[PDB]
Amino acid sequence: ATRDEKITYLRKIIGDKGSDAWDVAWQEGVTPWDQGKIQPPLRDFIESNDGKALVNKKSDNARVLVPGCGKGYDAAYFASLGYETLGADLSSTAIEKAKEFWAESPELKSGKLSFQTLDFFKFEVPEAKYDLVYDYTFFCALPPDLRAPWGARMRELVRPGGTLITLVYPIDGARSGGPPYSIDVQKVTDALQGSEEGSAEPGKYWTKVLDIVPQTSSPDHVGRERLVVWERINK
Ligand SMILES: Nc1ncnc2c1ncn2[C@@H]1O[C@H](CSCC[C@H](N)C(=O)O)[C@@H](O)[C@H]1O
Ligand SMILES: Cc1cc(C)c(S(=O)(=O)O)c(C)c1
Ligand SMILES: [Cl-]
Ligand SMILES: [Cl-]
Numbered sequence: 001a002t003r004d005e006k007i008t009y010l011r012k013i014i015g016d017k018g019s020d021a022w023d024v025a026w027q028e029g030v031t032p033w034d035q036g037k038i039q040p041p042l043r044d045f046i047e048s049n050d051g052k053a054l055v056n057k058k059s060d061n062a063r064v065l066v067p068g069c070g071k072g073y074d075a076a077y078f079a080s081l082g083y084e085t086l087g088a089d090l091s092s093t094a095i096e097k098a099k100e101f102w103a104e105s106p107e108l109k110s111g112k113l114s115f116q117t118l119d120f121f122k123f124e125v126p127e128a129k130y131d132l133v134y135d136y137t138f139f140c141a142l143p144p145d146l147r148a149p150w151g152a153r154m155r156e157l158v159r160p161g162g163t164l165i166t167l168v169y170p171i172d173g174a175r176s177g178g179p180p181y182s183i184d185v186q187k188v189t190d191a192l193q194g195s196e197e198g199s200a201e202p203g204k205y206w207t208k209v210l211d212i213v214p215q216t217s218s219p220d221h222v223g224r225e226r227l228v229v230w231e232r233i234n235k
């Protein structure tokens with residue numbers, strides 16, 4: 001009934017079942033992460049001068065991926081901006097619940113928004129790749145040993161010149177255990193920029209164009225959140 005009890009249980013079943021535990025949690029209603037809406041820093045970025053420029057330059061066929069989308073609030077948001085958007089989640093339960101929650105969306109109706117039960121690590125990347133990817137409470141959901149393949153998938157998923165937005169949360173310092181794991185921008189950087197081969201200064205695969213403290217974090221997010229925008233390079 002308590003958040004902590006619910007997190008304790010989520011971590012217990014992740015220990016027994018691995019990644020299969022996520023659909024179990026959704027089936028059983030153990031969804032402590034669920035907020036019922038997007039995080040404000042996403043809307044405020046999109047509505048900022050950098051955000052307007054990003055949306056205004058989008059191609060007519062521009063595609064968005066929202067991985068680990070849960071009930072899909074962020075995917076619905078991007079679809080409402082005119083992006084052909086895919087919300088992907090491992091859990092078939094989560095994906096049905098996303099289709100329920102957004103049942104009235106005009107973009108779900110048109111097919112411009114789509115929710116699909118997909119494993120972020122396994123699904124077939126479209127040939128044209130994604131123009132824009134948004135990661136929130138997905139990187140911090142993964143066990144630490146999966147951060148490196150997450151970065152590698154991100155490098156394959158975002159087209160050259162495309163953009164990845166990571167809302168980095170929770171930044172709780174040295175706290176161990178997860179989900180949610182305590183993350184920071186450095187951890188995201190190391191995953192995204194990958195192997196340095198011969199100890200090469202990171203900057204090989206992405207440019208970190210913007211890294212801010214959002215001025216409109218949710219109250220329990222204040223002091224534990226950064227918004228980072230990454231551009232895919234090595235064209
Ligand atoms: N390999 C994987 N591929 C796609 N989704 C995954 C995944 N592993 C875990 N997930 C999903 O990641 C989510 C973590 S919590 C849901 C967070 C969501 N971004 C939100 O803000 O509401 C769960 O829904 C889980 O089903
Ligand atoms: C992946 C994940 C899981 C949980 C339990 C939480 S939360 O309970 O702290 O809100 C968050 C933010 C992300
Ligand atoms: Cl919303
Ligand atoms: Cl898949």
Ligand SMILES: [Cl-]
Nearest residue numbers: 122123124125
């Ligand atoms: Cl692939």
